[PDB]
Amino acid sequence: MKDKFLKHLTGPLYFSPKCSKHFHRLYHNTRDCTIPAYYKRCARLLTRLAVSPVCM
Amino acid sequence: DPTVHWLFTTCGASGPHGPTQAQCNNAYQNSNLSVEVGSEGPLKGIQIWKVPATDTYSISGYGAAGGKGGKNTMMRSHGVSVLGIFNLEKDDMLYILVGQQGEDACPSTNQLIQKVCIGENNVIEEEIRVNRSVHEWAGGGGGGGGATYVFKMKDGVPVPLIIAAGGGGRAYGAKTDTFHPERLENNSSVLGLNGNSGAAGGGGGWNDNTSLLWAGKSLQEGATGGHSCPQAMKKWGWETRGGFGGGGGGCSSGGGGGGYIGGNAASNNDPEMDGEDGVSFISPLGILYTPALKVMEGHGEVNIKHYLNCSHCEVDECHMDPESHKVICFCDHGTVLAEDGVSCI
Amino acid sequence: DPTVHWLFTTCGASGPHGPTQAQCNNAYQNSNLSVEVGSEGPLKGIQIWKVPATDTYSISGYGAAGGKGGKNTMMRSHGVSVLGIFNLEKDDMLYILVGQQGEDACPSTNQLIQKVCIGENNVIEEEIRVNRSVHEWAGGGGGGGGATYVFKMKDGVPVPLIIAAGGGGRAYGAKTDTFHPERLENNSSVLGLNGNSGAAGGGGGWNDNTSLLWAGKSLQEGATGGHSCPQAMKKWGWETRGGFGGGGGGCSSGGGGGGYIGGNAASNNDPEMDGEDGVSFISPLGILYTPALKVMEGHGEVNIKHYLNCSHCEVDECHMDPESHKVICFC
């Protein structure tokens, strides 16, 4: 319900296990991804996370 | 209550100079936040905050984005976010400088510069075609974003806790939207110098002496936003000053962004070299929660909340369900939380 | 055809007037996009796009955010996002009006006005102590946001495909941040009127006759952003105009938001009543992807890409490889 939209904004990005831990942190405990009005910000964050070499 | 949090904004201010006491008092009406703002001296616009109870706090520092270029179509360099996990005592003083966005090249209320912006006036393009660089007609380059600082006053000298770097300014002819990997400093022994300034203004660092009116100032000099290029004021009617927090000003090159170490700018007046962003900082006294990532598009901000101490479950990471006030601890590696709510299966 | 999408923006333009041909040619240099911009009439600023293939396309329209208030501390009302699934024929002339952000109340270049904005002046604050009605000076309301329109012609008559409503304006006394539930309309039989305009300008709908100067225009008459209220025009010197795409006019209240139906403004000059949002629209010929959500913080945009047939097989989710058909449903 709030994940397909974020998937559309973000695109096909894959996450490694440690990166999955950081993914959980941004996705649940950062208010950019909690409240609906900052999804762009959220999406941006996720994108940048995938850029880091810790994320496959 | 887990939901309680304090949101420090730029108090409605913008541009090279930070907020006043009245701005922050108006910005925090009918809320749970109250700050005092330094009126004079290098602490002008820095919001002091008293920690209400001793606890473990998560601090979210968001820097500010840079300014758009003259051909304001390429996206602005975004401001960096740092999450830190710190521990705070009663009556502690947290000095928070919230970063401010660098001023854009376009639009401009000046009529001549506006006619330049809409493409009817294109003398800058002819100058680039002739001299391969800008020397006469200094074009609109975006101002550097201001860093976000959360620090404290221990017995005479400030001690940094959270620094979120500011987005660099976008040059006049920035044909590339590629952004460099974000830079983070986890060690306090590395000096917080200022960014290099050429024609445009390098970003402001932590503690460095500024001799340039267009470069951003370090925090120990007030950290006011830098002025524009000297050629931007002569034979031109526009200025693009960097935001408060060390944001460098915008010449035909790009304005550097602030940080623990300030962002760079082009040594010459290259109309296509965007300004480098700053270097963020995380204190050894706290725990870094997530890496440094470019997120912000406008003014910086600070979000301080009670950290969810949830080492009670087997996995070190957990979160609060918006639907249920119950905490939810998850299991990675495809493991599934057991019925006990701690174990994994 | 890996990662072939086209992004339509405001071409670097801002304020109440749409982009022209020069700015859009400047915006789409060294990219896979080329547009034409109308030069006059109701289509001045609306971008021309040729559909490259007869295919199913996903079109995502993001409206523009409204302007911030005089005490520009609260967040601006966000532009609504509409995602749709459409079927497009070869060589269609799509018409794309990209909404522009409503102008903020503060800062201003005037010295007296900046002195009001920072806090040294309180004539508005004292004025709401002596008669509680802002009519001698005018308060600070950001302009309404410019809606995002993607439409086409049949028989020379416009046909709405994607309409994403623009953000309402932030009033002076915007002490709260609540927003009304996001209004989406699917049936096209309801006419696209404009919002109510009182002291501040309502939003500009799909097609309506707008006579008020401060109100925003509907698309079939230009969709120009309105001017500020005349009380702010004289002896107060405020020019907080709206955004391109039906952006309402800033006054003590908030400017209404553009959309298929424009955002209603305040009939009275209430400095604590903000600018209402517009009504977004999805075409009957398209498929709604996700509920409409207030998302964008600045100038709106449009993203068009080829739609991926995830639901062509049993599994509803798929992620095709760049060069190979790697949709997620195992055989």
Author numbering:
A (entry chain C): 93 to 148
B (entry chain B): 678 to 1022
C (entry chain A): 678 to 1008
Q: Which sentences did the original study use to describe this structure?
A:
Anaplastic lymphoma kinase (ALK) and the related leukocyte tyrosine kinase (LTK) are receptor tyrosine kinases (RTKs) that are activated by binding their cognate cytokines, ALKAL1 and ALKAL2 (also called FAM150A/B or AUGβ/α). Their signaling outputs elicit a range of pleiotropic activities in development and metabolism, and their dysregulated intracellular kinases are keenly pursued as therapeutic drug targets in various cancers. Recent structural studies revealed ALK/LTK-cytokine assemblies with distinct stoichiometries.
Here, we show based on reanalysis of the cryo-EM data deposited in EMPIAR-10930 that over half of the ALK-ALKAL2 particles in the dataset are classified into 2D and 3D classes obeying a 2:1 stoichiometry besides the originally reported structure displaying 2:2 stoichiometry. Unlike particles representing the 2:2 ALK-ALKAL2 complex, particles for the 2:1 ALK-ALKAL2 complex suffer severely from preferred orientations that resulted in cryo-EM maps displaying strong anisotropy. The combined use of Orientation Rebalancing in CryoSPARC and 3D refinement in RELION v5 with enabled Blush regularization, resulted in a final map at 3.2-Å resolution displaying an impressive improvement in isotropy, as evidenced by the 10-fold increase in the cFAR score, and overall interpretability. Most importantly, post-processing in RELION yielded a sharpened map with clear main chain connectivity and signal for most side chains, allowing complete model building of a 2:1 ALKTG-EGFL-ALKAL2 complex that includes the membrane-proximal EGFL-like domains of ALK. While the majority of the 2:1 ALKTG-EGFL-ALKAL2 cryo-EM map has a local resolution to better than 3.5-Å resolution, the C-terminal tips of the EGFL domains are only resolved at 4–4.5 Å resolution pointing to their inherent flexibility. Most importantly, though, this new structure is now the most complete ALK-ALKAL2 complex with 2:1 stoichiometry to date and agrees closely with the ALKTG-ALKAL2 with 2:1 stoichiometry reported by De Munck and colleagues featuring site 1 (ALK-ALKAL2), site 2 (ALK’-ALKAL2), and site 3 (ALK-ALK’) interaction interfaces. Accordingly, the root-mean-square deviation (r.m.s.d.) between these two structures is 1.3 Å over 675 aligned Cα-atoms. The site 2 interface present in the 2:1 ALK:ALKAL2 complex, but not in the 2:2 ALK-ALKAL2 complex, involves the α1 helix of ALKAL2 with a key histidine residue (H100) interacting with S737, Y739, and L760 of ALK’. Due to the asymmetric nature of the ALKAL2 monomer, the EGFL domain of the opposing ALK protomer (ALK’) in the 2:1 ALKTG-EGFL-ALKAL2 complex does not make any direct contacts at the “site 2” interaction with ALKAL2. As a result, the ALK’ EGFL domain is less resolved at its extremity due to increased flexibility, resulting in the absence of density for the minor β-hairpin in the cryo-EM map.
